[PDB]
Paper text:
Whereas mice only express CD1d, humans express a functionally diverse family of CD1 antigen presenting molecules, namely CD1a, CD1b, CD1c, and CD1d. Here we focus on mycoketides, a class of mycobacterial lipids presented by CD1c. To determine the mechanism of epitope display, we determined binary crystal structures of CD1c-MPM-1, -MPM-2, and MPM-3 at 1.7, 2.0, and 2.1 Å, respectively.
The synthetic mycoketide lipid moiety was used here to generate three new MPM analogs with predicted chemical stability. These synthetic analogs comprise a carba-mannose, where the ring oxygen is replaced by a methylene group (MPM-1), and two C-mannosides, where the anomeric oxygen is replaced by a methylene group or a difluoro methylene moiety (MPM-2 and MPM-3, respectively). The lipid tails and phosphate of all three MPM analogs were anchored to the CD1c protein. Despite this, the mannose headgroup of all three MPM analogs showed considerable conformational flexibility. The phosphate group was sandwiched between a hydrophobic cluster including Leu69 and Phe72 of the α1 helix and Val155 and Thr158 of the α2 helix. The phosphate was unable to establish stabilizing interactions with CD1c, except for hydrogen bond formation with the Thr158 Oγ atom. This was observed in the MPM-1 and MPM-2 structures, which accounted for its reorientation within this region. We detected a trace amount of PM in our MPM and MPM-1 stocks and detected higher amount of PM in the lipid extracts of MPM or MPM-1-treated cells. Recognition of MPM-1, however, was reduced, as seen by a reduction in IFNγ expression by CD8-1 T cells and significantly increased EC50.
Residue numbers in the entry:
A (entry chain A): 6 to 282
B (entry chain B): 1 to 105
């Protein structure tokens, strides 16, 4: 229904003479690209991370990114005068595009300053965030007047180059991005909820994609006290979820944890509590 | 301005079984600015061979990082995730509870 490709940058200005530049590329929540600051080159994290692009196209992009990172850093360091009151400060960029199953792609380029929205790119125009006053206004004047060809480069990249790349990247990675991975589950005790009370914990780990259902059970009866935590990341593209239950002293025998997930289909995981209680 | 304090969650990839190879994860999220020190610890000492995701951030511009290391638990060993950040007066150490993990909803 909706898939995104994001190129992000983080520019950390420590003082007038020292800054850091970092960046990466993401297919939804999956990191597909890194950036090597030592050598100024793209890091292709998967065998399919080139999508349908040729090496010449990617080399063009690499030179564009190296030049952008260096030149943005130096123009900010110039315009940031002596200050040292503003330092340290941090600039974040989130640019990219979205493919939608029924509609046209979306493209975007958003900038934050010290964690707050600063400005964004709207088709032809750099637009200050209403919430970041003077500074946003000032920067946008310059971006709209002085850097006017960089602007058509940006528009072409986010509106044309990015959705083309994303389509080819989804196609090259199709037998990874549509994978199904089955979780495992295990039970443990948890911290005491109170005197004469126990906490049972059902850990579910290694599933992909993220939608999942977990309930504590007594036979076929779902248990009221079931409480799910957040869906947390594992390395190598799977997820983790904890489901707890508080139970009265003398009542835990016969309880089980039941897991439903797309990768199982009609073979729910059912794990019985066998003690520690 | 503004500054946001990291949230620290510690959990294992597989059931905690002594002598069985496993992965220890530390998910550190919701912080700003990006400058941070995150270390996985074994008996108080930084684990030197770890992996971490590249820096990324959420829709609200707060940063997040996933740390992980291969480890083999035993009954005596204590594992933790330690974080220092400008929002933190003193480094914060989040001990890994083997049974519960150490999460923050
Ligand atoms: C960074 C982290 C990387 C992570 C790895 C990512 C790896 C990954 C595979 C990347 C694939 C990304 C997909 C394919 C697309 C994604 C676009 C992204 C969403 C949008 C990001 C745009 C920013 C970042 C670039 C800024 C523009 C320069 C700043 C332009 C500066 C000058 O350029 P300019 O064109 O104006 O040059 C002039 C021209 C004119 C005539 O035009 C001439 O007269 C004159 O002489 C000059 O040559
Ligand atoms: C060419 C490679 C990438 C190009 C990107 C364009 C760089 C733009 C540099 C932005 C620096 C602007 C900061 C100026 C600070 C300022 O203008 O201060 C406002 C106050 O003076 C208001 O009174
Ligand atoms: C700027 O910060 C860097 C990194 O901490 C440091 O090495 C350098 O000495 C600083 N430069 C100054 C304060 O002029
Ligand atoms: C104190 C100086 C703050 C500089 C604001 C950074 C604006 C960078 C936006 C550039 C996007 C291409």
């Amino acid at each position: 229904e909706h898939v995104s490709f994001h190129v992000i940058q983080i520019f950390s200005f420590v003082n007038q003479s020292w800054a850091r530049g970092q960046g990466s590329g993401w297919l939804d929540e999956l990191q597909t690209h890194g950036w090597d600051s030592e050598s100024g080159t793209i890091i292709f994290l998967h065998q399919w991370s080139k999508g349908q692009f040729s090496n010449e196209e990617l080399s063009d992009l690499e030179l564009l990114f190296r030049f952008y990172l260096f030149g943005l850093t130096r123009e900010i360091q110039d315009h940031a005068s002596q200050d040292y009151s503003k330092y340290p400060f941090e600039v974040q960029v989130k640019a990219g595009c979205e493919l939608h199953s029924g509609g046209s792609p979306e493209g975007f380029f958003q900038v934050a300053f010290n964690g707050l929205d600063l400005l964004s790119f709207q088709q032809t125009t750099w637009v200050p965030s209403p919430g970041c006053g003077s500074l946003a206004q000032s920067v946008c004047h310059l971006l709209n007047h002085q850097y006017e060809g960089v602007t058509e480069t940006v528009y072409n990249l986010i509106r044309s180059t990015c959705p083309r790349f994303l389509l080819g990247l989804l196609d090259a990675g199709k037998m990874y991005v549509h994978r199904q991975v089955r979780p495992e589950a295990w039970l443990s005790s948890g911290p005491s909820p109170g005197p004469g009370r126990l906490q049972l914990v059902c850990h579910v780990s290694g599933f992909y994609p993220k939608p999942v259902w977990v309930m504590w059970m007594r036979g076929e009866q779902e248990q009221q006290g079931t409480q799910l935590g957040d869906i947390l990341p594992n390395a190598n593209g799977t997820w983790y979820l904890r489901a707890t239950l508080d139970v009265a002293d003398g009542e835990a025998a016969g309880l089980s944890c039941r897991v439903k997930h797309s990768s199982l289909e009609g073979q729910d995981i059912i794990l019985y509590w066998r003690g520690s209680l | 301005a503004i500054q946001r304090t990291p949230k620290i969650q510690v959990y294992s990839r597989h059931p905690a079984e002594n002598g069985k190879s496993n992965f220890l994860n530390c998910y550190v999220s919701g912080f700003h600015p990006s400058d941070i020190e995150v270390d996985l610890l074994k008996n108080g000492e930084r684990i030197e061979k770890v992996e971490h995701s590249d820096l990324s951030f959420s829709k609200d511009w707060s940063f997040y990082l996933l740390y992980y290391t291969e480890f083999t638990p035993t009954e005596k060993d204590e594992y933790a995730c330690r974080v220092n950040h400008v929002t933190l007066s003193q480094p914060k150490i989040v001990k890994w509870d083997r049974d519960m993990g150490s999460l923050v909803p």
